Design a binder for this molecule. Structure first.
Ligand code: NDP
Ligand code: NDP
Ligand code: FOM
Ligand code: FOM
Ligand code: MG
Ligand code: MG
Lengths: 400, 398
């Protein structure tokens, strides 16, 4: 029975990983659940999995759950604050920690797990996008095992040889016969759209997606391919890949989740349904397998699988992400931050769809790059890029 | 560097194997080459790879090869005969044996390599199709390492977990998270041909294929999908898979070479160009990799990838192979033997394309022999199946 702490349990990934536990009760034991304010969900999960501890980052939210679970006859101890969240990730008896908390938060909670040398089911982008170098140095030193939950990175992991999986980010690709990592993406809803028309696309149009049913922020990132840009930054740190060892491909049907090109010409790939329980269950059971409740892929009910090379004129955000990587963590962190601001501004109809790539670029052009030396430095670059971006949005919505 | 013995060196697989070592001279050393009658090719291979021994099946070929090499100043020791071929497969110093001798001829040499506990680069169908249980038991005994060279079996191997790769054939699939083995095939040239027209298809039409570079016999097997039927039989033995754990899928483009379905829903697959150097190099380097000379698969220059379920009314040989497996090695051995006869008959225009499956079935219905218990027993079933097949062909042509 693997002991696990779930960081961000009430979210989509959180509830999904919990469903995998349901399907395999004798395989996993929930030791701790961590969340933000969604007391309701927390209550249900605690009542179902009898966690030893439960924490909410919000003091108030924590008080309600504190008593709500008291009366419910629950014997789970309720705590609160980041400090507590971080302790849950470092519990002596916990084997794995699902790091599903997003944004700047979750950075310290995930780092806490890495420093405790635990197995980390990496389900957040912030870690590698903003602290790529710092986190990979920490995992190497603390000997923690990273197991990527993100569909693409997970497909890549499953398609890699054992020696790289066990020394992720440290092992050399070439020495292990890998020539490159093939990062795949759908290309979004504007894959065919004339370039001239991108500037007038609306939020509803941008958030139009077939495959995965993600939120609006991620749907837009998929339309600009900033999402793939961020996964590119992540992949290089995670798999120890140079620019020439990375290949980005458009695969509209999203059946293949990503692949790995080898020395003898072999290309290994992972295919599946657009259901996160698969990659989640894979990381949870690794190196073994477990039922995830996901229905088997029916090859007789598929659209023809196609591929294409992305055009940077169409996806400038993709190229921006690639360039930001060469500039360091300050750059990628700033790009990520600006993008959060611009996508939100676009969604609020304050700027055009094409203003996202334009403002993201402009923010990076004005930032004073100073490579962070710890997460606190990273957080400062984030806050600073976030402010620079808000002003560009206001400057654009006002007069400029 | 690894020392190898190449069984069937002058053939297609053998030449592809030698190209792989040619690309990695410091990784492999050719210690012994074995062939049949192509003295010409054997001489050039001996001259380039400096093997310790060179073995020809035919004694006359051996003698001719011997005079060729001396005239060229080569000191390669020349031998001849089956026993000699077996000795090459068991040399104490050799690490790997590329089992590429086709047909009944490859049986003893391959078994000799297995008995010697060598790492076997299995590139012949005769072995598992006719001596499935016998050979798989032989492997567990000597604890020899099997590495499938067949494109599909190789693709499946690469998409399997390590505990199965080692312990190939005896490890449990469910235990290791495997739901099923997805065996893919192109469906051949008559994939969309009206069923009514199949009876009139010509050897030339049947042998068309933008696919791989195969002989006419294998070409025909791809149009009847008897090839896939044979791979179904092998895969069952090789991966310790039951009927429910096997899925056969038509994939016209042949970019995906086969796949493996897992419990969490993941499906792992191997893709690549239609070049045997890739899987051969995979087996030779396992668990590492080496350049094979195969160009990288360009995803931007591909036809859309499609899949379909095999229609048995169109591919009766495929259903026939599946049913024969249930019966035993006598049935699979007989089916394989009969098919060689009927396909040759079709190529010589003695029978029609659709008669291949009809006569294959007829032979299995007439025989009903007993479960063989050694190589001589299967060789006997093969012999009998062939004569029954020849009589079927003859009474049909008259
Ligand atoms: N969704 C997907 O399929 C995938 C997502 N990812 C990455 O996973 C992440 C977001 O995933 P998604 O998880 O599904 O989420 P939401 O569905 O966004 O879940 C966020 C969770 O973390 C908790 N949370 C937020 N802030 C804090 C904080 N300060 N302290 C503690 N808990 C906090 C909140 O719970 P509460 O609601 O109670 O506030 C909530 O459970 C990002 O890192 C994303 O880029 C990667 C691959 C696939
Ligand atoms: N081609 C492919 O991509 C694949 C083929 N296979 C399997 O590979 C096999 C045959 O392959 P292919 O190799 O290309 O062949 P040919 O190109 O048919 O090679 C046959 C070889 O073995 C030698 N040979 C024949 N009879 C004997 C004998 N009695 N003793 C010693 N050597 C003998 C003959 O050489 P010589 O010509 O000198 O007589 C020749 O080198 C079959 O077992 C087939 O089903 C499996 C997967 C992929
Ligand atoms: O983990 C899932 N994704 O990244 C999918 C979201 C957009 P894409 O299909 O273009 O990669
Ligand atoms: O090892 C390779 N093959 O079997 C490919 C031959 C073409 P087919 O799969 O359609 O029979
Ligand atoms: Mg993703
Ligand atoms: Mg084959």
């Amino acid at each position: 029975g693997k002991q696990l702490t779930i960081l961000g349990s009430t979210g989509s990934i959180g509830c999904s990983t919990l469903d995998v536990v349901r399907h395999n009760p004798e395989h996993f034991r929930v030791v701790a659940l961590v969340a933000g304010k969604n007391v309701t969900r927390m209550v249900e999960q605690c009542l179902e999995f009898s966690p030893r501890y439960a924490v909410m980052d919000d003091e108030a939210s924590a008080k309600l759950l504190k008593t709500m679970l008291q009366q419910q006859g629950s014997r789970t101890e309720v705590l609160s604050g980041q400090q507590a969240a971080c302790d849950m990730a470092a519990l002596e008896d916990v084997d794995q920690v699902m790091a599903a908390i997003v944004g700047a938060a979750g950075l310290l909670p995930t780092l806490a797990a890495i420093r405790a040398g635990k197995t980390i089911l990496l389900a957040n982008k912030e870690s590698l996008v903003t602290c790529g170098r710092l986190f990979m140095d920490a995992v190497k030193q603390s000997k923690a095992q990273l197991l990527p939950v993100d569909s693409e990175h997970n497909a890549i992991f499953q398609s890699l040889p054992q020696p790289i999986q066990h020394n992720l980010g440290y092992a050399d690709l070439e020495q292990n016969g890998v020539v490159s990592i093939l990062l795949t993406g759908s290309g979004g809803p504007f894959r065919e759209t004339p370039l001239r028309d991108l500037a007038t696309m609306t939020p509803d149009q941008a958030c139009r997606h077939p495959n995965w049913s993600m939120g609006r922020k991620i749907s837009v990132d998929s339309a600009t391919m900033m999402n793939k840009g961020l996964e590119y930054i992540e992949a290089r740190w995670l798999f120890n890949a140079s620019a020439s060892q990375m290949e980005v491909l458009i695969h509209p049907q999203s059946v293949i989740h990503s692949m790995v090109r080898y020395q003898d010409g072999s290309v290994l790939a992972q295919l599946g349904e657009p259901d996160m329980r698969t990659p989640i269950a894979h990381t949870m059971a690794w190196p073994n397998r477990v039922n995830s409740g996901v229905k088997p892929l029916d090859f007789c009910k598929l659209s023809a699988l196609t591929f294409a090379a992305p055009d940077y004129d169409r996806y400038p955000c993709l190229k921006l992400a690639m360039e930001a990587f060469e500039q360091g963590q300050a750059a990628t962190t700033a790009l990520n931050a600006a993008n959060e601001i611009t996508v939100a501004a676009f969604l609020a109809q304050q700027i055009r769809f094409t203003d996202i790539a334009a403002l993201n670029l402009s923010v990076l052009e004005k930032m004073d790059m100073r490579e962070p030396q710890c997460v606190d430095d990273v957080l400062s670059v984030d806050a600073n890029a976030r402010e620079v971006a808000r002003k560009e949005v206001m400057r654009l919505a006002s007069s400029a």
